[PDB]
A paper describes a structure:
These dimers interacted with their symmetry-related dimers, forming filamentous oligomers with asymmetric flat surfaces, which we refer to as flat filamentous oligomers (FFOs). The FFOs had a width of ~14 nm with a ~5 nm distance between adjacent F-BAR dimers, while the F-BAR dimers were ~22 nm in length. The lateral alignment of F-BAR domains in FFO appeared to be similar to the pitch of the GAS7 striations on the monolayered membrane. The FFOs of the F-BAR domain in the crystals appeared to be mediated by two GAS7-specific loops, filament forming loop 1 (FFL1)  (aa 171–197; GAS7cb amino-acid residue numbers) and filament forming loop 2 (FFL2) (aa 206–219), which are located on the convex and concave surfaces, respectively. The positions of the two FFL1s and FFL2s are symmetrical; however, one of the two FFL1s at the convex surface of the dimer interacted with the tip of the adjacent dimer, and one of the two FFL2s at the concave surface of the dimer interacted with a conserved region on the convex surface of the adjacent dimer in the FFO, thus tilting the helix bundle relative to the plane of the FFO. One of the two FFL2s lacks contacts with the adjacent dimer and protrudes from the FFO surface, suggesting the direct contact of the FFL2 with the membrane.
In this study, we show that GAS7 plays a critical role in phagocytic cup formation in macrophages. Crystallographic, electron microscopic, biochemical and cellular localization analyses revealed that the GAS7 F-BAR domain possesses unique hydrophilic loops that contribute to two-dimensional sheet formation of GAS7 on flat membranes of phagocytotic cup, indicating that the sheet-like assembly of GAS7 is essential for phagocytosis. In addition to the F-BAR domain, GAS7b possess a WW domain, and GAS7cb and GAS7c possesses a WW and an SH3 domain, while GAS7d contains only the F-BAR domain.
Numbering used by the authors:
A (entry chain B): 172 to 475
B (entry chain A): 171 to 475
């Protein structure tokens, strides 16, 4: 008829009529985690809900690790900027003069500019990617545990109710036996003091049957409460996982855009050097130099 | 005395000053402004203008060397950057993220390696097209100038020698003149028979000394003219060399600029695949992938009995 596994009742075996999915054909949490998972390695049994929770937790661990990756990237960029900046301060070939000297100086200064660009890049990574990836929903900690214990407690109630039901089944079958006995005693010899006990047996028996019906009802109520809770919570988990994926995609797109625009900014720093390289004139340089270093403008002549 | 001699080279006195026009009277050329020696701003020492030109050449070579080394530093930096980027690209952080999100993440990591390739290639091209050409330009120039130095220097030595002779000759002249001018006095006070022949000897040797002077002056002027023409051609050569130096340096710095540009373009192009996969991320499909593998069963509970 039906079957009970871990205090929960399912159809049996069956090739039964029914059953349409709750959300076709999304692979929803609310449709595929009713049975409990028996680990095949022999470490106990857990509700499917536990699988959902572990999946969520793992998701958060993942976004943490991503954040860490970005932190490492930031560190690399800072070292790069550091080196570029120090090299920009280098005094190599500083005594080169003229428009050539100007262009060279501008090359070094351009190095400084690149360094600043990459530093700001790393800062933007920090504010707009690393911290958001990390600091996303810090408060899942005991909250999700709370949810867990909630569902678990509902399962507790279910188990209790099942126990009560089984007890009722015992009492019922027992009383039935007692009545079917005492009616045989009425078949052998009433009497009249024996008879009202035969009536009382019927009383207590039917009473026990009503007790059974009651216990079964309360069981079904417990399972239905557990059911509705299961549904709402699992859908909540589905939504949360989806939006996790969404925010991560968003911030990775952020990373890509920052990379792109940072490389544009970086490329734009050699243009000043280019402007000066075009203005380089060997003749003008030479004349400037001769103007500052001449020994005199008189030519030799013959003696006497 | 209408000329003046400083450091064995003869210039007008000035006067006042004559005039004389420049060889290249619109340019501030090497051939017009480095005949005189530069006076030490303190002592009684001088150095030739030509030496100033030579020193300028040497400085030029030193400077292209230093630029080359600067580029070496840049190469080292880029290489360290590339190394770090490569190692981080190999990191296994969040490797257990699965589905299209996991794949997009994987490409995020790989793009770092791609950047590494770009920057490494950048540094390599810096080495090939910028550093080495700067360093290896005119390798024997150090000695090519040294030889050049000796050339002009040797001429100047000769000039000095000639000048010395001239001065020596003047000594001999002034002496002989006096020797004559003072033997006529001996005849003026106590004339005798040997003194006349001593005046004859004196006059002879005197005119001879004068002829020696004239000759020495001629050879001096000859030496100075040789020094002059050679000086001119050589200074024009150094002018040309400095020009071609500046031009090659400009060329290779432009090369540097080009490498910068294309390196930043290549670098920018590495996030495009990441973008492409990032657009393909689907939460629903991901979920389907996971649930298909982790479902416990799709049968719902029912009522007892």
């Amino acid at each position: 008829n039906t079957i009970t596994i871990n205090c929960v009742t399912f159809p049996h075996p069956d090739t039964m009529p029914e059953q349409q999915l709750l959300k076709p054909t999304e692979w929803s949490y609310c449709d595929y985690f009713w049975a409990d998972k028996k680990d095949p390695q022999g470490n106990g049994t857990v509700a499917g809900f536990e699988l959902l929770l572990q999946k969520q937790l793992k998701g958060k661990q993942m976004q943490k690790e991503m954040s860490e990756f970005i932190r490492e990237r930031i560190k690399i960029e800072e070292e790069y900027a550091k080196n570029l900046a120090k090299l920009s301060q280098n005094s190599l070939a500083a005594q080169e003069e003229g428009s050539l000297g100007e262009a060279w100086a501008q090359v070094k200064k351009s190095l400084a500019d690149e360094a600043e660009v990459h530093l700001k890049f790393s800062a933007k990574l920090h504010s707009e990617v690393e911290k958001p990836l990390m600091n996303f929903r810090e408060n899942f900690k005991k909250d999700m545990k709370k949810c867990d214990h909630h569902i678990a407690d509902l399962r507790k109630q279910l188990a209790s109710r099942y126990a009560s039901v089984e007890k009722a089944r015992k009492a019922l079958t027992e009383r039935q036996k007692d009545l079917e006995m005492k009616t045989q005693q009425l078949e052998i010899k009433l009497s009249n003091k024996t008879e009202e006990d035969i009536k009382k047996a019927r009383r207590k028996s039917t009473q026990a049957g009503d007790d059974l019906m009651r216990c079964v009802d309360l069981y079904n109520q417990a399972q239905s409460k557990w059911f509705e809770e299961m549904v709402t919570t699992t859908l909540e988990l589905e939504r949360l996982e989806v939006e996790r994926v969404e925010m991560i995609r968003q911030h990775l797109c952020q990373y890509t855009q920052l990379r792109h625009e940072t490389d544009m900014f970086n490329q734009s720093t050699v243009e000043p050097v280019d402007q000066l390289l075009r203005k380089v004139d060997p003749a003008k340089d030479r004349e400037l130099w001769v103007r500052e270093h001449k020994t005199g403008n008189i030519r030799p002549v013959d003696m006497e």
